[PDB]
Structures are given as C-alpha cells and as structure tokens.
Amino acid sequence: AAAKKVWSARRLLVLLFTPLALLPVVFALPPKEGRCLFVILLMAVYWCTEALPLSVTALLPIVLFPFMGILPSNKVCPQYFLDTNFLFLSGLIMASAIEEWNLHRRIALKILMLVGVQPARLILGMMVTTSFLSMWLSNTASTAMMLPIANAILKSLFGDEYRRNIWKGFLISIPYSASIGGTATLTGTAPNLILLGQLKSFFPQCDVVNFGSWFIFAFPLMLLFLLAGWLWISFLYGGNAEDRARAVIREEYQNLGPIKFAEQAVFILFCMFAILLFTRDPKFIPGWASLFNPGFLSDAVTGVAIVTILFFFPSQRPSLKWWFDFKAPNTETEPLLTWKKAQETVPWNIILLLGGGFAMAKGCEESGLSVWIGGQLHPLENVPPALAVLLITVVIAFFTEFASNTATIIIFLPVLAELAIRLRVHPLYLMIPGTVGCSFAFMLPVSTPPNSIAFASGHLLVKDMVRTGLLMNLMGVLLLSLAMNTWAQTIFQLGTF
Amino acid sequence: MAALAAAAKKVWSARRLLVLLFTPLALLPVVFALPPKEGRCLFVILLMAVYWCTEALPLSVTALLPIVLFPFMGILPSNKVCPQYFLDTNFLFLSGLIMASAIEEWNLHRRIALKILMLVGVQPARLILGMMVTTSFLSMWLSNTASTAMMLPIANAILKSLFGDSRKEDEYRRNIWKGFLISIPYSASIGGTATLTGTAPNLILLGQLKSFFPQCDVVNFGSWFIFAFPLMLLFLLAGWLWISFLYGGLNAEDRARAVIREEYQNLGPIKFAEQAVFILFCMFAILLFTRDPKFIPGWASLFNPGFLSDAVTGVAIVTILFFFPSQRPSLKWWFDFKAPNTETEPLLTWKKAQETVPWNIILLLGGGFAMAKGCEESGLSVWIGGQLHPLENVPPALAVLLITVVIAFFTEFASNTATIIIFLPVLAELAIRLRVHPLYLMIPGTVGCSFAFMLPVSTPPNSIAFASGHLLVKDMVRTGLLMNLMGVLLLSLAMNTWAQTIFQLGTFPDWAD
C-alpha cells in the first residue's frame, strides 16, 4: 500500500533519518571520537544509499569537521587534493587523450583478432589485460583506459536478455579486475606504498618487505583471486557464423586504417608514463628519484609532467619543409589534447570523492578515533591470532566498501600497528592482511574510483554489483587467509615472533 | 619586403611552441645570477608569468607547473605543493561557482536582469545606467563572462526595437549602439570586484595572504564587501557618466518597453525552484556576510575560534541545492494513492554542476596558491625585499598610486588572475620594506588588476563585446584610458580614506614583521 510511496521518497527519508539514528553514537563514546564516528557513519550511509551525490557526500567533512571541532577548515580543505589525487587526475587525463584519438578502438580490434568472438574468452582476456595494466598503473587509471576499450568491443561484436547480461558482466569485470590487479605489486596501487611507508615509520628494524618479496607473495594471490572472479562473472553472466563475425572484425580493423601520428604520439606518451611511474623509485634498485632530494618527488610529479606534454605536442607530423615553403598555409596546429575536451571528459566527481576520503581519514586520525578503536580491540587477545586476523581482514574488506582504499588503509594501518605489538604477534601478519583487503572494494560504485568509472556507463545496477561483490569479498578474504596461513609465513618469516 | 612579411606570419603561426621552447632558454640566467633556491623559484615564477601572458599553454596547464618544477628543483616537496590547490579559498570559490550554476540553470539571472531593466526606465541615459547596474550587480555572483554573454542579446534586442537624417541620425544611432555595447563588459568588470567570489583575483589575494601572512585574517567576505561595494558604486557611476558623455549624448521608448515586457513574459510565472534558489542564494550571501563582520561579533563566535571559515558556509549552503526538491512538495501526495510515484528532481543535479563549473579557474587559483607558498618557503621573498632597497624613501601613498597604475595598465594585455598572481609577492615585499601594512599595497593591486578596459584581449567580456562588430579598438582605447585613470584615483581614495578603518591599516601589525 504505502510501501511504494515510502520507497519513492527514500532519498529524503534517508537524509533526515540517518543523523537521528546515528545520534546515539555521539553519546556512546568520548565526545571528539563520537563526533568523528558520527561523521564517518553518516558519510558511509549516504554513500551506500545514494541519498546525496557521491561528490556532495564527499564534501561533508568540510561542513562537519569544523563545526564539530574535529579539524579546522584550513586543515580539512587542503587534504582534498593531495598528490595521490593529482596522480589520479593525470591518469584520467591520459585516458581521455587515449580515447580522444580512437586508440582504444585499435586496441579493442587487436584484442578481438587475438582472442576471437567468445564472450567468456574476451572477458578472461580483459581480466588478464586490466590486471597486467594494474600492476604498473593505478587502479583508477587502468579502469579509465579499459572501459573505453571494453565498450568498443561490446559495440563491435553486438553491432535480448543475453546481450544485456553480457553488457553487465563485461562492464563490471573491468573495475573488479583492476582492483584485484592493484595488489600484487607495490607500485600497483597507492595503499601498498602507504603500507611500506607506515612500516618504515613504525618499524625501522623490519625491512624484509621489498618489491621482490611482495611480488612473489602476492602474484599467486592475483592468479587465484582473478580465476575465482572470472569464474564468478562467467557464471553470473553468460554461464559459419564465427567466420562471418571474424570477417566483419577484419573489415572494421581495416576501416580503422593506418595508425595516425597522433595515435603513435599518445601511445608513446602512455608508455613513457608507465615506465617513469615504475622506475621512479623501485625498492630493489634505486630509481631516478634518488637523483634529487629525498621525499620531494612522487608519482604525482611524473603524472603531471607527462600530462603537460599532451597539451602542447602537435597532433600532426611536423615537417621542416613547412618553414621554407612560403606557399604553405599559415594555420595553427592542433595539439594532442585541448583543455576543453579534457575538462569535458575528466570525472571531477571522482577527484572530489577521493578528496573526501582523504579528509575523513585525516579527521579520524586527528580526532583520536583510531586510537580509541585500537584500545577497544584490546580484549581480542585470548582469541587465537589466526581467526583474529581473519576477522580483522573481514572487517577491513567490508569497511573499504564505503571509503576509498587509500582512506581505509590510512585509517586502519596505525591501529593494526599498535594492535600487533600489543598482542605479541608479528606486525606483518596484520600489516599485509589489511593492505591487501583494502583493495577488496566491490559492493558500491563509491567503494573505489574504478567502480564509479564502470557505473558511469549506465549499464550496471547497484543490486547486481552488490551481488557480485558479496562473493568477491568472501573469496578474497578466504584466499587472504590461506595466503597468510601457507606461504606468507615463510616469504616474510612472520610465522615466528 | 614580402619575404619578411611571410617570415613574420610563419613565426606568428608557431608562436606558442616558440615561446614555450625558448622561455626556459631566455630565463636560464636568473638561476646563475641569484642564490640557488631563490634563483630556481624566480625562474619558475617568471616562466609561469611568460606562459600565462603569451598563452603558450592553457592557463590550467601552466597552473600545474609548480607540481613539476618545485619538487625537481628542491624548492618544495610534492606532498607540500599538491595540497595547496584546494585551500579553503578554493572551496569558497567552488561553492560560489555551484551557486552561480544553480542560479543560471533556473533562469533566475534573466528574470532579475529583465526586472531591473523594467524598473530603471527606457530613456537612453537611464537605459545605459540600468544596463550597467544590472550587469555589475549580477557580476557580483556570476562570472563576468556569463553576465556579459547574457546581457549582450538583451541589449541588442532593445536597440533593434528602439531603432526599428544624413550623418546626424545614423551617427547618433551608431554612437548609442557603441555606448550600450561598451557599458556591459565594463560594468561586469567593475562589479566583479565588489565581492570576494565576484572574481578570481580576490580569492588569489586571500590564498596568497594565507601563505605570506598566515596570522592575517582581517580580510573576509564582510570586510571585503564593505570596503569594495562603495568603491564599486562610485566607479560604476563614474563609468556610466563617462560612457553617456562619450556616446549617450549626456513611440520608440514604448516599443522598447513592449519588447522588454514580451521578453519578460516569455519567462513564465515564477516557479517554486526559482524561489528556492533565490532564498538559498540570499541565505548564502547573508551567512557569508555575518560570519565575522569584525565590528559585530558574528555567528562564528558560537563555535571553536579559528575553525569556521567562508568555505564551510559556502559548502554547507550549496549542499542543500543537491537534495532540495525543485517542485513544491505537497502533503496530500502521501494520502493520494492515485498520484504517480515519479522520482522528484533536486534543485541542482551534479551532472549540470560538473558541466557548468569552470574547473580551469579552480586549477589556476590552486597554481597561484602553490606559487605563493613556494616563493615564501624558498626565501625568494626575502631576496626581493632586500633588492627593493631603493624603493624605501617613497611615500606610501605615492607607492600605492604607482603600483595601482602599473597593475591597471599591465592587465590590459594579460589575464587579471595571472597579473595579480605575479604581482602579489612583490607588493607584499614592498609593503614590508616600507614599514606599512601589507594590505595597504595588496588590496590596491587586487582591485586594480581587474581594471582591464582598453583591449578586447584584456578580459573575456571585452572579447564578447568585440565579437558583435559594432565596436572598434579605438573606442575601447579611448573609453578605457580614462576608465583606468578614474578607477586608479577612486581606488587610491578608498585605500587612503575608509579602507584604513575597515582593515586597520593605520599601524604596522605585529604579524607583518
């Protein structure tokens, strides 16, 4: 009867009734911690229920932290656009440049020629490709450069419920594969570098974690969880015609024609971006960041430097004969990317969302909420450490679904640092579970910017994404526990304290 | 001689690449001339200045230069320069842009403009005055470019309706056309200085104050408004008199009033969304004003000192735009089971906001703040103060006149925001070296960098007006020369008479030393 009427106004009802429901939190724990927890819970609920746009919810700290006395405006506001956000913006601009010159179509047609007209094989090929791209570029960047290519593929082979299901599956597998792939390498995603920095700050003695050890530990995790995710996606979606379809694919590739100068320039700039990102500071061989002051340079500097070239590099081959040829027309050349097209195609909502995550992370750190959570985790000492770490990675994997991976790893890593020494257990045996599990962001489009990029297409629903992310999180947690039980104990020698 | 012309044309064709690849080569000697950190910071600042003035790179891309240059050159680490791009001043700017987008999306701006045009009159001088008043009062909150772009069609329609012999009549017609087409961008530029969110340079002043003098907080929305609004009104009246004398000659009226009515009636009745947006904008302005007027204790005194700012108020106000319904809610909807259950539309959707907010200006403000921070940390400001030794005996008032004239005539070629970004550290150092309040030199520069009246390339509103075709460059120059002179004189009067009381510039402050 009235259920439809109530559901019609669900957004306003959530907006007005969430602070009322979260009010007892403020009185439950100490004042500043209570206010910070209230803000975190309000932001998480508004993100899950989509009561407000993800950017508008991301701007909540600017209003709530100063009013509640947690952080001043001049402290919460600068956190919104940190160097990690600049790296993400540079990756988004690079993806926009790649898509703007129809290089994504070329890559898509090459992938179809390599694989063939089979939805499951194409899905697996994109899982592999996006995971490979995620080990060297950040998850958001790989997702932004791979959704255009996936959409090109889908428009290629398909030119009714089966088609729509393939749409859903092959548009949702890309952000999920990127999130899975970010974990294997330290350079793969920001939370790994955050973990390394927090380990260096907290534990100068502990230095067993490097690029090689982390890679050999986490690449099997990539393979296992990627196979599990691919099987889950295939089961959920999709369970002389072939010659004609392949002939159409060759015809489309020929219709693409020879590769233009702008396409090659953009591809070379992308390759330089990836190479300079990887070689900036490897943990086994010093990078070119050692040629400068220590700690001055980061991935943001490289991203902005590479992106700046796109805005002045010519999109046509420059000929020295033009200067001598007085008969040639004197027309201005088109750069690789104009700022108008970039501003049109850059998702500033994702930038604001990441900034809100950073701001809420700093608010949690400054208000003393993290210390309070660490203190409340005290009675988890008579409980055996194995399933204790299991439940810790469970709660981390189910908390990263609201905020960004960076925000949740920053929030939870010092808590685990205090907890591990308090409980007489190996610090890494808690460091690495949380760092890996923060990337297990699969429920909501707000969980990670890859999910937002995928959801921006409009072919994905919240219900289907949550249904997939349930089992994705469960298998990720189980594989994390298995890794910590079998081969993490010997690679990182964390089985003996 | 034709070969030289062809070579010059070819050089001008590739001027952007030539400037971009030759500016570092030309600016290399400053690194060797100066101490290392100061020299590198000066090289970066001059490179950004040249790139902004010549438009070799997009303004946003040039604003991202510090993120590359400061970490490489050791001036400032990445984790210290990157957060400078969203200081709370930039979030106040973003909130103002969101409010302006909400106002424009519901045609409230057109309704206000047409109402003011109806009220002011139809007489030539009265029509010019009403057009200028509308453009200036509407540029306080909208961008000057948007106000000019909306007001040009209305002025064109009114002029066509009004004039629907020999040299006298058509000369008068063309002069009247020129007067209306020149009165809009000048009024927009004048009005932009009235409010902090009116134009970017005011927020640049705020952000660079946050860096050079973190202890300085006397400049806020209320103080800036109470300082600039009388000055804006005086300069607007002076410009109106000047334009009317130059051009306005200081049934047709019935037809013009009829076309204004028809343009107003086409807006339809005032809808609930327009009223809601107007009320939200009024609360926005009032709460920005009354947060800390500095002469009545504002509502910020009810919370922790130093925690609240104009950014918090702006974000809180513009948050309501994204969930407040656009249609009037009805209590009977719950009772009426037969009514459709269609989802309601908010006042502003994030799609429209994202597609109607100029993120380029946000990045430009962030780049300016980052450059100010780098100049402060690198010690280049101390070097500039040391080198400003000869300019120590100059009277402070004469110094204000000279800096205002220089900045007002410099902005005629480059962007106002870039001009103020480049000039603000120099003004700060000169004010420090003169044993006078830093604001006494910062505020004249911030106000005068918007005194861009002489060229179509000075401001985008000037280009919009020039695109009509009824105006020549000579008219621009003749009007803007005396416009600049009058603006400089009025700015000096304001800075010497009543800005002293508003900003307490009489005594050198403790935080300035």
Ligand SMILES: CC(C)CCC[C@@H](C)[C@H]1CC[C@H]2[C@@H]3CC=C4C[C@@H](O)CC[C@]4(C)[C@H]3CC[C@]12C
């Ligand atoms: C539905 C969404 C918005 C909120 C869901 C969580 C709510 C219902 C939870 C979170 C924390 C909870 C509080 C935590 C602790 C206490 C103290 C004790 O007296 C029991 C009730 C009380 C006061 C709880 C009430 C319910 C509570 C406020």
Ligand SMILES: CC(C)CCC[C@@H](C)[C@H]1CC[C@H]2[C@@H]3CC=C4C[C@@H](O)CC[C@]4(C)[C@H]3CC[C@]12C
């Ligand atoms: C609602 C979902 C997302 C889980 C979020 C956990 C929050 C809402 C709940 C779970 C556990 C709860 C806490 C459990 C124990 C205590 C200690 C007691 O002395 C006061 C209440 C307090 C401090 C509770 C506050 C609310 C709390 C932190």
Ligand SMILES: CC(C)CCC[C@@H](C)[C@H]1CC[C@H]2[C@@H]3CC=C4C[C@@H](O)CC[C@]4(C)[C@H]3CC[C@]12C
């Ligand atoms: C059929 C077998 C024997 C030979 C296949 C050769 C061609 C089709 C293969 C060999 C190497 C392949 C490339 C290897 C890596 C990448 C990078 C990835 O981000 C997009 C696809 C792309 C660009 C592949 C496209 C297809 C490719 C060029």
Ligand SMILES: CC(C)CCC[C@@H](C)[C@H]1CC[C@H]2[C@@H]3CC=C4C[C@@H](O)CC[C@]4(C)[C@H]3CC[C@]12C
């Ligand atoms: C162009 C691509 C390959 C990246 C840039 C080149 C990289 C690989 C080069 C350029 C400068 C090089 C560094 C220069 C000097 C040293 C000091 C030496 O004691 C250890 C290696 C180390 C730290 C080098 C590592 C490799 C390095 C970083």
Ligand SMILES: CC(C)CCC[C@@H](C)[C@H]1CC[C@H]2[C@@H]3CC=C4C[C@@H](O)CC[C@]4(C)[C@H]3CC[C@]12C
């Ligand atoms: C300064 C020295 C190195 C020589 C000049 C180098 C640079 C500035 C020159 C070399 C080749 C030139 C290009 C050659 C041809 C064209 C195509 C024409 O339709 C627009 C200009 C454009 C795109 C020129 C721009 C300037 C250019 C890139």
Ligand SMILES: CC(C)CCC[C@@H](C)[C@H]1CC[C@H]2[C@@H]3CC=C4C[C@@H](O)CC[C@]4(C)[C@H]3CC[C@]12C
């Ligand atoms: C919700 C996010 C932000 C934080 C992570 C969850 C936190 C709040 C949860 C996870 C584990 C929880 C604790 C689990 C067990 C106990 C013992 C009980 O006798 C009192 C509550 C207490 C001490 C809980 C307090 C809240 C707690 C620390």
Ligand SMILES: CC(C)CCC[C@@H](C)[C@H]1CC[C@H]2[C@@H]3CC=C4C[C@@H](O)CC[C@]4(C)[C@H]3CC[C@]12C
């Ligand atoms: C880029 C254009 C528009 C502005 C002018 C840039 C060049 C020509 C200017 C900027 C600053 C100047 C330098 C400033 C100071 C000195 C020290 C002394 O030895 C005199 C020459 C020398 C070394 C100047 C040489 C020319 C110079 C490098």
Ligand SMILES: CC(C)CCC[C@@H](C)[C@H]1CC[C@H]2[C@@H]3CC=C4C[C@@H](O)CC[C@]4(C)[C@H]3CC[C@]12C
């Ligand atoms: C909310 C607005 C738009 C309409 C309501 C009237 C305005 C003028 C009201 C609402 C709240 C009011 C403020 C509430 C509290 C204080 C603190 C007191 O020590 C001085 C007056 C001052 C600073 C009030 C000034 C007037 C004020 C700003």
Ligand SMILES: CC(C)CCC[C@@H](C)[C@H]1CC[C@H]2[C@@H]3CC=C4C[C@@H](O)CC[C@]4(C)[C@H]3CC[C@]12C
């Ligand atoms: C304050 C608490 C107690 C009650 C809140 C009631 C709110 C959520 C109700 C009251 C009136 C309602 C509106 C009444 C009529 C319509 C038109 C119809 O197309 C549905 C949306 C819309 C626009 C409703 C949205 C929800 C609404 C605003």
Ligand SMILES: CC(C)CCC[C@@H](C)[C@H]1CC[C@H]2[C@@H]3CC=C4C[C@@H](O)CC[C@]4(C)[C@H]3CC[C@]12C
């Ligand atoms: C539009 C024009 C004609 C009117 C304004 C003219 C300007 C230049 C005049 C008007 C008021 C004047 C100021 C009034 C009083 C003083 C105090 C005196 O101890 C030094 C000069 C100083 C600071 C004057 C400087 C010049 C001044 C600013």
Ligand SMILES: CCCCCCCCCCCCCC
């Ligand atoms: C005085 C009470 C302090 C604790 C509760 C604060 C509640 C703030 C709610 C803000 C909601 C913003 C989105 C509608």
Ligand SMILES: CCCCCCCCCCCCCC
């Ligand atoms: C203990 C001193 C502060 C008391 C109030 C804290 C909560 C303030 C909430 C303000 C919310 C404003 C929403 C627009």
Ligand SMILES: CCCCCCCCCCCCCC
């Ligand atoms: C046939 C291809 C020849 C080489 C083309 C190179 C284009 C530009 C690549 C990116 C260069 C970035 C540094 C200037």
Ligand SMILES: CCCCCCCCCCCCCC
């Ligand atoms: C070793 C010399 C240091 C000083 C000169 C550095 C020059 C950097 C030029 C950067 C240009 C960026 C825009 C093309």
Ligand SMILES: CCCCCCCCCCCCCC
């Ligand atoms: C004294 C230690 C640093 C030496 C080099 C300083 C200048 C570096 C310039 C790098 C420019 C990079 C442009 C992309």
Ligand SMILES: CCCCCCCCCCCCCC
């Ligand atoms: C007779 C007056 C009718 C007014 C209709 C529009 C009301 C808009 C109210 C907006 C309130 C925003 C803050 C809650």
